[PDB]
Design a protein around this ligand. Structure first.
Ligand SMILES: OC[C@H]1O[C@H](O[C@H]2[C@H](O)[C@@H](O)[C@@H](O[C@H]3[C@H](O)[C@@H](O)[C@@H](O)O[C@@H]3CO)O[C@@H]2CO)[C@H](O)[C@@H](O)[C@@H]1O
Ligand SMILES: OC[C@H]1O[C@H](O[C@H]2[C@H](O)[C@@H](O)[C@@H](O[C@H]3[C@H](O)[C@@H](O)[C@H](O)O[C@@H]3CO)O[C@@H]2CO)[C@H](O)[C@@H](O)[C@@H]1O
Ligand code: NAG
Ligand code: PCA
Ligand code: CA
Ligand code: CL
Length: 495
């Protein structure tokens, strides 16, 4: 349940579709000095090379083998990345696609990222190897062989998720091949895993697989370190399967988090920020110590999976920064920051027809992440984790780690504020008028740099400065026209 990050590092970033060499560099030049705890990488195992449409991001969720050979790089490059990141104290978490192999209708051949042969029709994946009796064809009871109704917990686990050949996870052989793959990764140095499509696997089968896993590599981690496990289970209520069914295996993605935060920040259905005072279990969320939270993920930022139209993304920059800021300042859950790439989003009748577009590329080859002088990224990589407002809130969370949620204030509408012990204080204005008021910050008297509008550099603030008096009070002024309608100050932004 523990992330295995360095003490004081409290977040992981999803460097979606990034190449291994770029992640390795990012660890050394940025993630390490900026206090990021780790990186969730895209599936590192060989997948189907899909040409129609052209190399969609989702082709990586169709395994062909467990060879570490993808568009992100080969095994040597993967190992090089894990080693270099671990050497600077930044962890690597692998997106483990272990519930299935490729779509059952994909043409047999060698159209795979490493050239391995596979035949979906005959259930033949010799590179693993898996054969017909390693899948759930006979176990599934639906007429189509695919998942048709989520109100039936059994078919959700034994049938094909949108046609993806479903592995027979009850078999020791299958459990062992998956464990062989995961242990290869652990011994390489990975600190944990995102278990893809966990709702589609029986809690007990996941447990059986986890029981076969090694402790983390003792060259970098303390003896007895268990891999961090966060299971992707979309539970927004209304279905028989609950996130809690997976608590015995590790943490679980809390999709209610971004869904509700999005509706609140967008002020949909009469919701408003003042309602966030009891954010957390009070909103029907799972226990904080089991939650992996995020504003958006690779699926819902483009209409896939679940979360709805309320999901905030980099496309909604201003509101997105505020949502991410609230998440990073609030003690609930373990935080994951999204880092995306820009694609030609094209809405037709309310839906994005280009929701399949893969990462920036030249004839199928993923483009490198270029770093501009102003620290932003080029080649269409968004790099939200490099936005000052987000990067500084990632540090805010580190600085206030362990401090209690306190000194809450709200105007009964959308102007709220709260502190984290005596280490940090944050103020938000999402109303259509100015927020000008003196608030109790719980902070020691002094001059603090607002880390949203600026930075503390060479003993000075580059942005707004906040003055806390002997009584712990400070005046905050945020116009509804402000570039970023929120201010955040903490112990390490004090002059
Ligand atoms: O030997 C030729 C044969 O090799 C490969 O077969 C593998 C199976 O596909 C794979 O399932 C596994 O078989 C095991 C069963 O799953 C398990 O329940 C129990 O019966 O033990 C079996 C043997 O370990 O391993 C075999 C052998 O690697 C390949 O996939 C076939 O196409 C090929 O004919
Ligand atoms: O530290 C680097 C810079 O980080 C910040 O720049 C961010 C913006 O804050 C962010 O909103 C985004 O720019 C968007 C713009 O503000 C938004 O209105 C529009 O819809 O989309 C824009 C994307 O083109 O991305 C940049 C980083 O690329 C910070 O504001 C800035 O001062 C820092 O220099
Ligand atoms: C802070 O900024 C002021 C104004 O530019 C400058 O005079 C002062 O020397 C700076 N202090 C430090 C520590 O650099
Ligand atoms: C937590 O993520 C990991 C898996 C469960 C455990 O004991 N450690
Ligand atoms: Ca399944
Ligand atoms: Cl996820």
């Amino acid at each position: 349940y523990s992330p295995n990050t360095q003490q004081g590092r409290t977040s992981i970033v999803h460097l979606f579709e990034w190449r291994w060499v770029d992640i390795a560099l990012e660890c050394e030049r940025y993630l390490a000095p900026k206090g990021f705890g780790g990186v969730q990488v895209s599936p590192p195992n060989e997948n189907v090379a899909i040409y129609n449409p052209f190399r969609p991001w989702w082709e990586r969720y169709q395994p062909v083998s467990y060879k570490l050979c993808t568009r992100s790089g080969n095994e040597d490059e993967f190992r090089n990345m894990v080693t270099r990141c671990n050497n600077v104290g930044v962890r690597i978490y692998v997106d483990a696609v272990i519930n299935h192999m490729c779509g059952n209708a994909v043409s047999a051949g060698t159209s795979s990222t490493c050239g391995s042969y596979f035949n979906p029709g005959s259930r033949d994946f010799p590179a693993v190897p898996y054969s017909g009796w390693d899948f759930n064809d006979g176990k599934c009871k639906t007429g189509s062989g695919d998942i048709e109704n989520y109100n039936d917990a059994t078919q959700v686990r034994d049938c094909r998720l949108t046609g993806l050949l479903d592995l027979a996870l009850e078999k020791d052989y299958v459990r062992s091949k998956i464990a062989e793959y995961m242990n290869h990764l652990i011994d390489i140095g990975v600190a944990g895993f995102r278990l893809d499509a966990s709702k589609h696997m029986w809690p007990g089968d996941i447990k059986a697989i986890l029981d076969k896993l090694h402790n983390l590599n003792s060259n970098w981690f303390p003896a007895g370190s268990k891999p961090f496990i966060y299971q992707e289970v979309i539970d927004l209520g209304g279905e028989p399967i609950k996130s809690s069914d997976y608590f015995g295996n590790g943490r679980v993605t809390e999709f209610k988090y971004g869904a509700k935060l999005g509706t609140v920040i967008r002020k949909w259905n009469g919701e408003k920020m003042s309602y966030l005072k009891n954010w957390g279990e009070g909103w029907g969320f799972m226990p904080s110590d089991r939650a992996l939270v995020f504003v958006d993920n690779h699926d819902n930022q483009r209409g896939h999976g679940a979360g709805g139209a309320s999901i905030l993304t980099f496309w909604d920059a201003r509101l997105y920064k505020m949502a991410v800021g609230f998440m990073l300042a609030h003690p609930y859950g373990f935080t994951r920051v999204m880092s995306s790439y820009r694609w030609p989003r094209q809405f037709q009748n309310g839906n994005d027809v280009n929701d399949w577009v893969g990462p920036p590329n030249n004839n199928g080859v993923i483009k490198e992440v270029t770093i501009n002088p102003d620290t932003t990224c080029g080649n269409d990589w968004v790099c939200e984790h490099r936005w000052r407002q987000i990067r500084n809130m990632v540090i805010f969370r580190n600085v206030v780690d362990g401090q209690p949620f306190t000194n809450w204030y709200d105007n009964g509408s959308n102007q709220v504020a709260f502190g984290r012990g005596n280490r940090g204080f944050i103020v938000f204005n999402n109303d259509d008028w100015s927020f000008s008021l003196t608030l109790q910050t719980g902070l020691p008297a002094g001059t603090y740099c607002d880390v949203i509008s600026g930075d503390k550099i060479n003993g000075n603030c580059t942005g707004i400065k906040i003055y806390v008096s002997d009584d712990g009070k400070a005046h905050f002024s945020i116009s509804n026209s402000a570039e970023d309608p929120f201010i955040a100050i903490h112990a390490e932004s004090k002059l």
